From Swiss-Prot:
Effect of residue 67 to A: Increases fluorescence at warmer temperatures such as 37 degrees Celsius. In GFPmut 3; highly fluorescent mutant when excited at 488 nm
Gene3D superfamilies: Green fluorescent protein
Subunit structure: Monomer.
Resulting phenotype, residue 63 to N: In R10-3; matures to the red-emitting state with excitation and emission maxima at 555 and 585 nm, respectively
Coiled-coil intervals: none
Phylogenetic classification of the source organism: Eukaryota, Metazoa, Cnidaria, Hydrozoa, Hydroidolina
Reported effect, residue 201 to V: In EBFP1.2; shifts the excitation and emission spectra to shorter wavelengths and increases quantum yields compared to BFP
Keyword 4Fe-4S listed: no
Outcome after substituting residue 144 to K: Increases fluorescence at warmer temperatures such as 37 degrees Celsius. In Esmerald; leads to brighter fluorescence. In VisGreen; leads to brighter fluorescence
Protein name in UniProt: Green fluorescent protein
Listed GO biological process terms: bioluminescence; generation of precursor metabolites and energy
InterPro entries: GFP, GFP-related, Green_fluorescent_prot
Outcome of mutating residue 63 to L: In EYFP; leads to yellow fluorescence, folds faster and more efficiently at 37 degrees Celsius and has superior solubility and brightness
Length: 225
């Protein structure tokens, strides 16, 4: 039944509270998702303390329920099946030769709006590293998210690598471990192994003077014929 909530365009709200190496910050996002086309459009704004980390490092943390699952793969869509009551999404993101983020989010409907509420904690970052030193280019490389069932928690696990371009031409690797568990008591779908093919594009609003990120993202489930 959850999948029926996603047949049209759905408004999205994202709210994140962060602390990276003691630097506190907050992000508010708004936009919409159209899972029929695997399509997300979101604008994020930094609302409190100066953003202590580069915007691209926050993309994966800042609604995989908007993935396009092909018809023949619908039985594998855990994310929509948990709706409207939602799911908890937790990650550990390890930045190679640098610190880590631990994130805990709840993704659920509030009325007709899909909401992603996040707490992010970053520790062990290096002062003159690529993250605290703001050495990452404002762009994104196009990410297979590998998913498997977690039967004992009636949920899923995922793992994937993202690669963030450094201004010198090199790359900063981010290893992601992910777990999702339902919030409510409805039945959920436990998937066969598969992946999400993801492509994100970052831009700026030329009329926006606040620190911000515009994101256009397309995601399609794959790996099953």
């Amino acid at each position: 039944k959850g999948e029926e909530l996603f047949t049209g365009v759905v408004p999205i709200l994202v709210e994140l509270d962060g602390d990276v190496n003691g630097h506190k910050f907050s992000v508010s996002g708004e936009g919409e998702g159209d899972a029929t086309y695997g399509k997300l459009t979101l604008k994020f704004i930094s609302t409190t303390g100066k953003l202590p980390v580069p915007w691209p490092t926050l993309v994966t943390t800042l609604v995989q329920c908007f993935s396009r699952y092909p018809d023949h793969m619908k039985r594998h869509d855990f994310f929509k099946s948990a709706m409207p009551e939602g799911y908890v999404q937790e990650r550990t993101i390890s930045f190679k030769d640098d610190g880590n983020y631990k994130t805990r989010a709840e993704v659920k409907f509030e009325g007709d709006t899909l909401v992603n509420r996040i707490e992010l904690k970053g520790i062990d970052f290096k002062e003159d590293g690529n993250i605290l030193g703001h050495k990452l280019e404002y762009n994104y490389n196009c990410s297979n998210v590998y998913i498997m069932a977690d039967k004992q928690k009636n949920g899923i696990k995922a793992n994937f690598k993202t690669r963030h371009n450094i201004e010198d031409g090199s790359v900063q690797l981010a290893d992601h471990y992910q777990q999702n568990t339902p919030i409510g008591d409805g039945p959920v779908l436990l998937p066969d192994n598969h992946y999400l093919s993801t492509c994100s594009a970052l831009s700026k609003d030329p009329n926006e003077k606040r620190d911000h990120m515009v994101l256009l993202e397309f995601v399609t489930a794959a790996g099953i014929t």
